[PDB]
Design a protein around this ligand. Structure first.
Ligand SMILES: Nc1ncnc2c1ncn2[C@@H]1O[C@H](COP(=O)(O)OP(=O)(O)OP(=O)(O)O)[C@@H](O)[C@H]1O
Ligand SMILES: [Mg+2]
Lengths: 35, 505
């Protein structure tokens, strides 16, 4: 289907830190250890 | 090899223990029946008392009783404010470490033991876990402990050491605000979503306000504010002063009960106890047996008068929340929920003030402003209990390395991104969302145009508006005509890449 690839403005994302609690973090923590 | 788990909240004034039931998290009460267990330790005739029992001995046994010591672990001696320990055993310097002099031995002629604040924390934690152990019938191996945001790793390691010295295994150290949010989102009634949350932890000796960004059910902390001036102790003073003035008027000539330590200690206990009744009832009694000069004092107060004499402090809380939301670079319009936590959040008036501060959209979670709200005291212990429950299967190297590397690396987008629909801007991925994520919602062809979006405020009074940023990619699907709905899904990537897919009906 129609699918386009766009690039976010390089300054659109600043470095921040997260709270390592909850199932949604722990489930996502699995993906990071894998890669 | 396997473990028993609890959630343990550790405060200067009160501490709680909570276990996990497969369906829901349960706060454990101690053998005194207290779910809110005072962080107090005392010694009488060689017997150790903790919690409520130790709290009572502050009258007849002030010097062998230790309270308000959590904010003293890992602390340089000058950094601590011994204001609150003046009533009880005073802290003392041992070079780098803070120590207390208390008579914990049974023998009268024995010298008083000089114990480190770490050892104090160690003995209390042993009893605390044990009360949970007795309820559960099983020795408790592990727990997760809540912590404030601004205390250093020196304190954290000190806590772990004292917990290790109490043969208790600390899985992770989680933050007191994040525990409160987890305590709500993990419940079945809650629905995870992307919303900006502000947690107001009102305590006894301190109050912490924290602003979070809940995106994809994951919490990222935007700003933090601490204040050691507006708290429950100030409110206790409001009652202590109010009732002390009344005592002298009724009993002329007697000593001011504030000027006698034993009489003042009785006032503090009773002022708090009346304050708690004023959170549950519209009328509460205040009494002290042989307050001073052998005179009983008895009085009452209704909630409305209390709210009047406590108006000054309450407005202090308002400025805390406004400062924190301001510290995040936000407006009260940007706030979706406010999770009220801490022991003072049971005050009904504080919720009412917060309703006035915030728009009608904003959710205020307290037993007096929401049918779905939880007990503000139990939140952190429930948060800890849940977190401890999920971790128990994993191993300590898994927790330690995943903590620092994975949590730091994820960046967050500073602008919202959505499709534009004129004849306006609708957000798809709320701003400050962590990458990578995915979001999707629902007489001619449909034209989807993805753009950046920011939130502004216009004084015309004020309301939230969206200004349209740069266009990322543009897309059109040609043959749907009259259909009412359009499903668009878009995936941001770690490399800042943007991926739109079209198959909407
Ligand atoms: N039902 C209630 N109504 C009003 N105030 C209450 C109620 N329950 C507890 N408090 C007050 O809240 C304070 C304790 O709150 P909490 O137990 O969260 O504090 P803590 O975290 O142990 O102490 P701190 O935050 O100062 O280290 C005390 O001042 C207590 O008097
Ligand atoms: Mg607290």
């Amino acid at each position: 289907d129609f699918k386009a690839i766009g690039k976010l403005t390089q300054e659109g994302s600043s470095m921040r830190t997260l709270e390592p609690v909850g199932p949604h973090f722990l489930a996502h923590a699995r993906r990071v250890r894998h890669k | 090899g396997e473990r028993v788990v609890i959630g343990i909240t550790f405060g200067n004034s009160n501490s709680s223990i909570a276990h996990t039931v497969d369906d829901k998290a349960e706060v454990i009460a101690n053998e005194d029946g207290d779910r809110q267990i005072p962080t107090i330790l005392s010694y009488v005739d060689g017997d150790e008392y903790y919690g409520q029992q130790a709290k009572n001995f502050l009258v007849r046994n002030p010097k062998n009783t230790v309270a308000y010591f959590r904010d003293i672990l890992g602390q340089d001696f000058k950094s601590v404010d011994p204001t609150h320990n003046h009533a009880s055993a005073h802290p003392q310097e041992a070079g780098d470490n803070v120590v207390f002099t208390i008579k914990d031995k049974a023998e009268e002629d024995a010298e008083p033991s000089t114990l480190t604040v770490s050892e104090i924390a160690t003995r209390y934690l042993r009893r605390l876990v044990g009360a949970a152990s007795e309820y559960l019938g099983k020795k408790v191996t592990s727990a997760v402990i809540t912590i404030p945001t601004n205390f250093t790793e020196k304190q954290k390691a000190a806590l772990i050491a004292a917990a290790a010295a109490a043969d208790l295994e600390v899985l992770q150290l989680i933050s007191e605000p994040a525990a409160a949010v987890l305590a709500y989102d993990a419940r079945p009634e809650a629905t995870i979503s992307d919303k900006i949350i502000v947690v107001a932890d009102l305590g006894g000796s301190r109050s912490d306000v924290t602003v979070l960004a809940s995106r994809s059910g994951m919490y990222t902390i935007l700003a933090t504010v601490h204040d050691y001036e507006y708290h429950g102790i100030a409110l206790d003073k409001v009652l202590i002063d109010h009732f002390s003035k009344e005592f002298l008027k009724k009993n002329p000539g007697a000593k001011d009960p504030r000027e006698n330590p034993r009489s003042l200690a009785k006032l503090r206990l009773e002022a708090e106890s009346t304050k708690r009744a004023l959170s549950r009832s519209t009328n509460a009694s205040f009494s002290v047996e042989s307050l001073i000069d052998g005179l009983d004092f008895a009085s009452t107060i209704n909630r409305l008068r209390y709210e009047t004499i406590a108006r000054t402090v309450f407005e202090g809380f308002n400025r805390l929340v406004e400062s924190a939301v301001k510290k995040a670079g936000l407006d009260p319009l940007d706030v979706d929920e406010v999770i009220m936590s801490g022991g003072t959040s049971n005050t009904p008036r504080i919720a009412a003030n917060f309703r006035y501060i915030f728009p009608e959209s904003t959710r205020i979670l307290a037993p007096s402003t929401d049918p779905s709200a939880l007990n503000p005291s139990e939140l952190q212990a429930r948060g800890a209990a849940l977190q401890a429950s999920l971790i128990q299967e994993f191993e300590t190297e898994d927790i330690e390395q995943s903590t620092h590397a994975a949590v730091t690396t994820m960046p967050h987008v500073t602008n919202a991104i959505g499709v534009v629909s004129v004849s306006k801007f609708v957000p798809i991925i709320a701003p400050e969302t962590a990458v990578p994520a995915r979001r999707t919602v629902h007489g001619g062809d449909v034209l989807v145009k993805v753009v950046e979006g920011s939130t502004h405020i216009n004084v015309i009074k004020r309301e939230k508006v969206w200004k349209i940023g740069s266009t990322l990619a543009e897309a059109a699907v040609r043959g749907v005509k009259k259909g009412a709905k359009v499903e668009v899904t878009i995936n941001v990537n770690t490399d800042l890449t943007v991926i739109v897919t079209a198959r909407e009906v």
